[PDB]
CSV table of C-alpha atoms in Angstrom, one decimal:
chain,number,residue,atom,x,y,z
A,1,UNK,CA,4.5,14.4,10.4
A,2,UNK,CA,5.3,10.7,9.6
A,3,UNK,CA,2.1,9.7,11.4
A,4,UNK,CA,0.1,11.8,8.9
A,5,UNK,CA,1.6,9.9,5.9
A,6,UNK,CA,1.1,6.5,7.6
A,7,UNK,CA,-2.4,7.3,8.7
A,8,UNK,CA,-3.4,8.6,5.3
A,9,UNK,CA,-1.8,5.6,3.5
A,10,UNK,CA,-3.7,3.1,5.7
A,11,UNK,CA,-6.9,5.0,5.4
A,12,UNK,CA,-6.8,4.9,1.6
A,13,UNK,CA,-5.6,1.3,1.6
A,14,UNK,CA,-8.6,0.3,3.6
A,15,UNK,CA,-11.2,1.8,1.2
A,16,UNK,CA,-9.2,0.5,-1.8
A,17,UNK,CA,-8.9,-3.0,-0.4
A,18,UNK,CA,-12.5,-2.9,0.8
A,19,UNK,CA,-13.9,-2.0,-2.6
A,20,UNK,CA,-11.6,-4.3,-4.5
A,21,UNK,CA,-12.0,-7.1,-2.1
A,22,UNK,CA,-15.8,-6.7,-2.0
A,23,UNK,CA,-16.2,-6.6,-5.8
A,24,UNK,CA,-13.6,-9.3,-6.3
A,25,UNK,CA,-15.8,-11.5,-4.2
A,26,UNK,CA,-13.6,-11.9,-1.1
A,27,UNK,CA,-12.8,-10.5,2.3
A,28,UNK,CA,-10.2,-7.8,3.3
A,29,UNK,CA,-8.5,-10.5,5.4
A,30,UNK,CA,-8.5,-12.8,2.5
A,31,UNK,CA,-6.6,-10.3,0.3
A,32,UNK,CA,-4.5,-8.6,2.9
A,33,UNK,CA,-3.6,-9.1,6.6
A,34,UNK,CA,-3.2,-6.5,9.4
A,35,UNK,CA,0.5,-7.2,9.3
A,36,UNK,CA,0.8,-6.8,5.6
A,37,UNK,CA,-1.0,-3.5,5.6
A,38,UNK,CA,1.0,-2.3,8.6
A,39,UNK,CA,4.3,-2.9,6.8
A,40,UNK,CA,2.8,-1.4,3.6
A,41,UNK,CA,2.0,1.9,5.1
A,42,UNK,CA,5.1,1.8,7.3
A,43,UNK,CA,7.4,1.4,4.3
A,44,UNK,CA,5.5,3.8,2.1
A,45,UNK,CA,7.3,3.3,-1.2
A,46,UNK,CA,6.3,2.7,-4.8
A,47,UNK,CA,9.2,0.3,-5.4
A,48,UNK,CA,7.3,-3.1,-5.4
A,49,UNK,CA,10.7,-4.7,-4.8
A,50,UNK,CA,10.7,-3.9,-1.0
A,51,UNK,CA,7.0,-4.7,-0.8
A,52,UNK,CA,7.6,-8.2,-2.3
A,53,UNK,CA,9.6,-8.9,0.8
A,54,UNK,CA,6.5,-8.4,2.9
A,55,UNK,CA,4.7,-11.5,4.0
A,56,UNK,CA,1.4,-11.7,2.0
A,57,UNK,CA,2.5,-10.2,-1.3
A,58,UNK,CA,2.3,-11.7,-4.8
A,59,UNK,CA,2.7,-10.5,-8.4
A,60,UNK,CA,-1.1,-10.9,-8.9
A,61,UNK,CA,-2.0,-9.2,-5.6
A,62,UNK,CA,0.3,-6.2,-6.3
A,63,UNK,CA,-0.8,-6.3,-9.9
A,64,UNK,CA,-4.5,-5.9,-8.9
A,65,UNK,CA,-4.1,-3.7,-5.8
A,66,UNK,CA,-0.4,-2.9,-5.6
A,67,UNK,CA,-1.0,-1.0,-8.8
A,68,UNK,CA,-3.0,1.7,-7.0
A,69,UNK,CA,-0.6,1.6,-4.1
A,70,UNK,CA,2.3,2.4,-6.5
A,71,UNK,CA,0.4,5.1,-8.3
A,72,UNK,CA,-0.4,7.0,-5.1
A,73,UNK,CA,3.1,6.4,-3.7
A,74,UNK,CA,4.6,7.8,-6.9
A,75,UNK,CA,2.1,10.7,-7.1
A,76,UNK,CA,2.7,12.0,-3.5
A,77,UNK,CA,6.4,11.2,-3.9
A,78,UNK,CA,6.8,13.7,-6.7
A,79,UNK,CA,5.5,16.4,-4.3
A,80,UNK,CA,8.4,15.7,-1.9
A,81,UNK,CA,12.0,16.3,-2.8
A,82,UNK,CA,14.4,15.5,0.1
A,83,UNK,CA,18.1,16.4,-0.3
A,84,UNK,CA,19.6,13.0,-1.3
A,85,UNK,CA,22.8,14.4,-2.8
């Protein structure tokens, strides 16, 4: 059901970036690009370390938007508990 997680992630990221980008006084493409978003949902991980390696990511960007991304990624993450031992 990976597609479900990715689809949901992108869907939420669209509204989040839309509201934040609209209020901030900019455009969605001015804050994030199709490629950046694609990789974001594709990776699906709170760890901002791996995200920083994604073209179009900065401390300020992740600090403003990334915050919500990490919160949700950490919330849903707690629900899952794959055997990593």
